[PDB]
Amino acid sequence: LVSITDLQGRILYANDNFCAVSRYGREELVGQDHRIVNSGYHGKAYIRDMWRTISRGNIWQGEFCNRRKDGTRYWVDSTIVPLMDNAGKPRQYISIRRDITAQKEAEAQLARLKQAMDANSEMILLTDRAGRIIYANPALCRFSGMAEGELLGQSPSILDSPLADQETLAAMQEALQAGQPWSGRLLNRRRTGPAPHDAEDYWAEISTTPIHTDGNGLVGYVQIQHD
Ligand SMILES: Cc1cc2nc3c(=O)[nH]c(=O)nc-3n(C[C@H](O)[C@H](O)[C@H](O)COP(=O)(O)OP(=O)(O)OC[C@@H]3O[C@H](n4cnc5c(N)ncnc54)[C@H](O)[C@@H]3O)c2cc1C
Ligand SMILES: [Cl-]
């Protein structure tokens, strides 16, 4: 969260949050080069631009991936500000940072998952507790051909033809929100699709399987095959 250094980067101070998250004690920090927490993650130009900005008097802003002691990595979002003389010359440096511990890990994850899901070439969507699409894979969007953003708000029934059997569609929907396994053929419509046009219908074999998460949480995992 907060530290101050002399012009050369030697930590003069060293706040409680900084000690907390760095898992370093204030006495192991004070008098150390701020390089102590460096991680190897950043290239020298990132560091060189930082020092090139602050030493000419300007505020700097950026993220830092830092090293905790036990060698583990954290993230911080920083603003570094110079303190001046007299002769308008930087004399000390104040760094105010929030720990983005955390939101960063919770993000490199999604990217991995998202990356794996996206490569699935089965047509798949995910539904929340209310049976609204929380995710639609590229195979499905491609074949639909609706862009995922058309889709996210909705209802899988947005994929169905106006010709579809309403009583089946409803069975599916009720399975989704209950959440129970369901499957079995619905007439879908795809955009062809400038259009409007539009529009071919085709029988879809459809499976849903509920997935309970923690916190009374529910997702419906949905497969769409051409029957
Ligand atoms: C207030 C304050 C807070 C900082 N917080 C962090 C932090 O949270 N995490 C972190 O990794 N680093 C931080 N630094 C800076 C620092 O230098 C650490 O060493 C950094 O980790 C450097 O890594 P490097 O070994 O890759 O440097 P090197 O890159 O090997 O430095 C060599 C090149 O010339 C440059 N240059 C011009 N003046 C200087 C100077 N005075 N010191 C170093 N290079 C200079 C560029 O640094 C450039 O990289 C902070 C500095 C200040 C002043
Ligand atoms: Cl058939």
Listed residues 120, 154, 182: the one ending a domain: 120
Q: Residue 223 belongs to a domain with what CATH number? A: 3.30.450.20
Whether residue 184 contacts residue 165, with contact meaning beta carbons closer than 8 Å, is answered with no
- Token pair for residue 90? 């930087």
- Give resolution, Å, one decimal: 2.3
Same domain? 96 vs 108:
no
Whether residue 54 contacts residue 100, with contact meaning beta carbons closer than 8 Å, is answered with no
Q: Which atom of ligand 1 is nearest to the CA of 55?
A: 38
Same domain? 130 vs 113:
no
Whether residue 201 contacts residue 215, with contact meaning beta carbons closer than 8 Å, is answered with no
Same domain? 109 vs 95:
no
> Would you call 58 helix, strand, or coil by DSSP?
coil
Query: In which domain, by residue range, is 16 found?
Result: 1-103
Task: Give the H or E element holding residue 142.
Answer: helix 138-144
Nearest by Cα to 213 from 116, 128, 133, 117: 128
> Which ligand sits closest to the CA of 22?
1
Same domain? 136 vs 161:
yes
Listed residues 120, 151, 169: the one ending a domain: 120
- Which residue has the least CA distance to atom 17 on ligand 1? 35
Same domain? 214 vs 173:
yes
Q: Which residues line ligand 1 (CB under 6 A)?
A: 3, 5, 8-9, 34-35, 37-38, 44, 47-48, 51, 64, 66, 76, 80, 93, 95
What is the C-alpha to C-alpha distance for residues 166 and 140, in angstroms, rounded to an integer? 22
Q: Which atom of ligand 1 is nearest to the CA of 8?
A: 41
What is the C-alpha to C-alpha distance for residues 109 and 105, in angstroms, rounded to an integer? 6
Q: Does 75 appear as a known binding residue?
A: no
Same domain? 139 vs 178:
yes
Please count the structural domains in the chain. 3
Same domain? 141 vs 89:
no
> Would you call 138 helix, strand, or coil by DSSP?
helix
Looking at residue 192, the DSSP 8-state letter turns out to be: -
Pocket test for ligand 1, best of 6, 47, 67 (most atoms within 8 A of CB): 47
Same domain? 115 vs 50:
no
- Token pair for residue 97? 């940072």
> Would you call 39 helix, strand, or coil by DSSP?
coil
Q: Residue type for 27, please?
A: E
What is the C-alpha to C-alpha distance for residues 128 and 84, in angstroms, rounded to an integer? 55
Q: Does 66 appear as a known binding residue?
A: yes
Q: Which atom of ligand 1 is nearest to the CA of 78?
A: 8
Q: Does 38 appear as a known binding residue?
A: yes
Nearest by Cα to 39 from 63, 20, 15, 18: 63
Same domain? 80 vs 67:
yes
- Which residue has the least CA distance to atom 10 on ligand 1? 38
Same domain? 15 vs 63:
yes
Same domain? 73 vs 171:
no
Strands 73-84 and 90-99: antiparallel
Same domain? 75 vs 172:
no
